[PDB]
Amino acid sequence: MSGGDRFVQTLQKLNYPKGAQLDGEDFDWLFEAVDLKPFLDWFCSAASEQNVVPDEKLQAFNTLKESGKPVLDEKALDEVLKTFSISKVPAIEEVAIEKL
Amino acid sequence: MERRSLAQELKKWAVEEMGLPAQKAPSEEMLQRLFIGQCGDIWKFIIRHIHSHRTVRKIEGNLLWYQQLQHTEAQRTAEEEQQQRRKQLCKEILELRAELHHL
């Protein structure tokens, strides 16, 4: 795999919308530049599918941020999301109608 | 002028968002060579959509949280219809128990 092949594969894993039309050989000149090679090798290793935020979630989070509602920090999110273990509580009142 | 601002945003994204140590970050003049031809649009997408795993969790879990909170408000209007149906069923049970007693 050339340096260009490896870059095009990382762009495909990152869901770049033109990633299927890119050929690997067209990018090999980026890896001939001795001084830029360490940064490109890092980018190709550090970026994964779990790092991608889709445009709808970015927009919805920006509207959440514009709505003036408080944005919970990571620890508060873990405490709230732990307490928000998916309690099948809608089943208890629905079971009261089914029993009746 | 545009290729210089994109070099700056990419350096900022690499150091602040993705956590690259600043001594390993190439110079802003070196980064400008990455915006030749079609590569300019590629790096714009990367800066906008690719976040740290920590930032992704904060975004997704706050969205999930407020979706669950709205689902609990919409559940109250369904609880009122369920309370009306429960009153209807309890009234029908009382009428049926009274008819059963008379039978």
Rounded to the nearest 10 degrees, the angle between the axes of helix B39-49 and helix A55-66 is: 50
How many other CB atoms are found less than 10 A from the CB of residue B14? 23
| Consecutive H or E run containing A11 | helix A3-13
For A91, other C-beta atoms within 10 Å of its C-beta total 10
What is d(CA B75, CA B68) in angstroms, rounded to the nearest whole number?
Answer: 10
**Which residues in chain B are closer than 8 Å to A50, comparing Cβ atoms?**
53, 56
Taking alpha carbons only, the member of B5, B70, B16 closest to residue B40 is B5
- Say what the resolution is, in angstroms: 6.9
Phi/psi at A52 (nearest 5 deg)?
A: -90, 125
Method of determination used here: cryo-EM
| Residue A89 touches partner B, C-beta closer than 8 Å | no
Tell which of A15, A18, A53, A85 to mutate to test the B interface (max B CBs under 10 Å): A53
A76 interface with B at CB cutoff 8 Å: no
